[PDB]
Structure 1
Amino acid sequence: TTNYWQDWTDGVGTVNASNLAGGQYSVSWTNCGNFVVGKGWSTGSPSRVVNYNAGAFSPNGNGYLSLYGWTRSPLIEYYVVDDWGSYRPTGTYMGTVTSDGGTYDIYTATRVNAPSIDGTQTFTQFWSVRQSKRSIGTNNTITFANHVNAWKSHGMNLGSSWAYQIIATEGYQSSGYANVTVW
């Protein structure tokens, strides 16, 4: 089961996050800047099968619910986005993957001198973004290998050093509430 709790905020606005029992967490936020909260594993794996149930996910404006993590060597921030608020995230279109009963658009982007796990850096994002919002309150699976192997087909190769891997709630200039269980 999960072994890791993430609670990162840029300190802008109010983000109240709770590390509940087991794989469960809750977050209430008001006029945030950027935050990432979630549960998962301190060391990511390309073969991990991730399960979650979002009891609530109600962003007022920009918020994502995703499988989220980083690699180093080189520095890559990756997302498998199942739900979003007002803004569907996009980048440069690479193609599509069908996994766990949904179709995802695959995108790349570069972030130049941006906040990272290793401070201000230039890094790449790999995205799988679902074409429609996934059901809330359902036991949902992400078969991450399908995304990794789809990304590999487009030359989107992850780094050799694996950092954390979580079901994350992320806000940007928004308010909202989320309650999520991960296993």
Structure 2
Amino acid sequence: DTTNYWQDWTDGVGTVNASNLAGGQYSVSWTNCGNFVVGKGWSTGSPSRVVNYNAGAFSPNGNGYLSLYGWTRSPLIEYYVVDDWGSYRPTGTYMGTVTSDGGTYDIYTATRVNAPSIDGTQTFTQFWSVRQSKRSIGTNNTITFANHVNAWKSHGMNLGSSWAYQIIATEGYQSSGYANVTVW
């Protein structure tokens, strides 16, 4: 189940240089970005996928995230399993916790109103698992996504029936930084 998909999306604000390197590896350098989502993974997500990564570097100067990230449709859901962040730890409405792969994660919901999405301007829902402390960087890290899917289900956070991409994403917001990550 090695990676099959490369994502290099930016809103075109500031400079985001993303490199599609061999296999599951990518890098990104950014200066004064708006928003971007870069990473590697799978063009069709699975609720049972076991994802592995090693972030050789993850050094946001300000707001960036390193997450398992993807979308469903029917309904439209943007989801995150956040292992590392910079200056800002993302939150929403608290639902409970899930303990997986050595971490305890807070579970949040949020609504995004007429906001940017995979289908342009849409009102959609976010499902979050946010680690309570930053995960180690430069280590081989597993995200057992079924644990998060099943924890989310227990709070009525059911994913949509149509799966879009599923990646280990570096995301920045009004920040600068560097990352270098290998996914498998």
TM above 0.5: yes
Q: TM-score, normalised by structure 2?
A: 0.99
Report how far residue 179 of structure 1 moved: 0.1
Q: How far is the alpha carbon of 1:30 from its aligned partner?
A: 0.2
Structure 1 segments unaligned to the other structure (5+ residues): none
Give the CA deviation at 1:9: 0.3
By how many angstroms is 1:19 displaced? 0.1
Moved over 3 A (4+): none
Tell me how far apart the structure 1 counterparts of residues 18 and 154 of structure 2 sit (CA, whole Å): 37
Gaps of 5+ in 2: none
Is 1:7 aligned with 2:8? yes
TM-score normalized by the length of structure 1: 1.00
Give the whole-Å Cα distance in 2 for the aligned partners of 1:99 and 1:13. Answer: 36
- Helix, strand or coil at the partner of 1:142: strand
Residue 92 of structure 1, CA deviation: 0.1
User: SS at 1:117's partner residue?
Assistant: coil
Count of residues in correspondence between the two structures: 183
Counterpart secondary structure, 2:173? strand
Q: Could you tell me how far apart the structure 2 residues matched to 1:103 and 1:112 are?
A: 29
Aligned partner of residue 147 in structure 1, secondary structure: helix
- The CA deviation at 1:42 is 0.1
Map Cα deviations across residues 106-141 of structure 1 (whole Å, 9 max, x no partner): 000000011100000000000000000000000000
**Helix, strand or coil: the match of 2:146?**
helix
1:143-182 per-residue CA deviation (whole Å, 9 max, x = no partner) reads 0000000000000000000000000000000000000000
Secondary structure of 2:148's partner? Answer: helix
Q: Deviations over 1:25-68 (max 9, x none)?
A: 00000000000000000000000000000000000000000000
